[PDB]
Amino acid sequence: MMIRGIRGATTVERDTEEEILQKTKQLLEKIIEENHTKPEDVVQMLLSATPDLHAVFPAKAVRELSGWQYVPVTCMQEMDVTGGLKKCIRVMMTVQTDVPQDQIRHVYLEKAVVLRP
Amino acid sequence: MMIRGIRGATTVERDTEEEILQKTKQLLEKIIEENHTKPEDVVQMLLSATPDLHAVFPAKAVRELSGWQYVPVTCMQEMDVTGGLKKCIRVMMTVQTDVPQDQIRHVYLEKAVVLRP
Amino acid sequence: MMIRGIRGATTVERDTEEEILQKTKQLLEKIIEENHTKPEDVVQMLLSATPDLHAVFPAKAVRELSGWQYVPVTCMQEMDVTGGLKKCIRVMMTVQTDVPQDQIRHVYLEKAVVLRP
Structure with a gap:
């Protein structure tokens, strides 16, 4: 068995809460889908945003x-x-x-x- | 075996080296107490600070x-x-x-x- | 097998793409040689830069x-x-x-x- 990092990246059209959560949720869903990920198997997650997004922490998603x-x-x-x-x-x-x-x-x-x- | 992320968060009243270290120390000691953490079993740790704190790296704690x-x-x-x-x-x-x-x-x-x- | 973090740090004289990439490559190479690291055993990597560096993502190295x-x-x-x-x-x-x-x-x-x- 092993531990591995999975990378994702998306963009939003505007710095709003809804946009950020929507696009984040969508990103996580696609990752989970393609990698058949179950939450019990996730060690941790790091999320980053570029300095032009302030409306909400993407982790809320x-x-x-x-x-x-x-x-x-x-x-x-x-x-x-x-x-x-x-x-x-x-x-x-x-x-x-x-x-x-x-x-x-x-x-x-x-x-x-x-x-x- | 399995590894697991543990999260902690705290706050300081003012941006001084002495408050950052003291609060950071206290956060880690609580995390350690609650999870029975031994240092040898710790893969790595990440510390973040909001952009209104500049006195010291909390990692110094x-x-x-x-x-x-x-x-x-x-x-x-x-x-x-x-x-x-x-x-x-x-x-x-x-x-x-x-x-x-x-x-x-x-x-x-x-x-x-x-x-x- | 147990998982473990390996810390490195380096500096650049100038904030240019070529020096950032050179110094980043040189850092990783040294970590790789001292720790006998094979890429398939690498879970993931995080690189940080101070806010005086904007020329490139170090990850490119x-x-x-x-x-x-x-x-x-x-x-x-x-x-x-x-x-x-x-x-x-x-x-x-x-x-x-x-x-x-x-x-x-x-x-x-x-x-x-x-x-x-």
């Missing part, structure tokens, strides 16, 4: 997922890089899994499809 | 804990949420444990008690 | 390492601390290992040598 109320999560500010993608929310979900590193399904949504390898 | 000198720890800036908790320091301690997810003991002290789920 | 293209990595902003080390990049690499906690090899390069315990 985690509590909208049935069964995820005990998954530990905290947020952080993403680096402000010159030319870097605007209004972008990123996740690092750490899970216990037997899926090989090269088979993990990292998720890029909305404008963040540009950051896809 | 972690060496006021004897036996904790080899625990890897690093800091990061929390995102600046409009109306979010001020002067708040947050921990994500990643430990090895067989305590089930719904039984991990997350610690919310001072004004941060309102962050309790 | 990781992509210069053959065998490392599936290692999940993301960045964040380090807190701005009065008297804190300028132009500094920090890493937390989380890895599967049987090496004991007090035997793990954390790496401090360039002006970050001052961060060594």
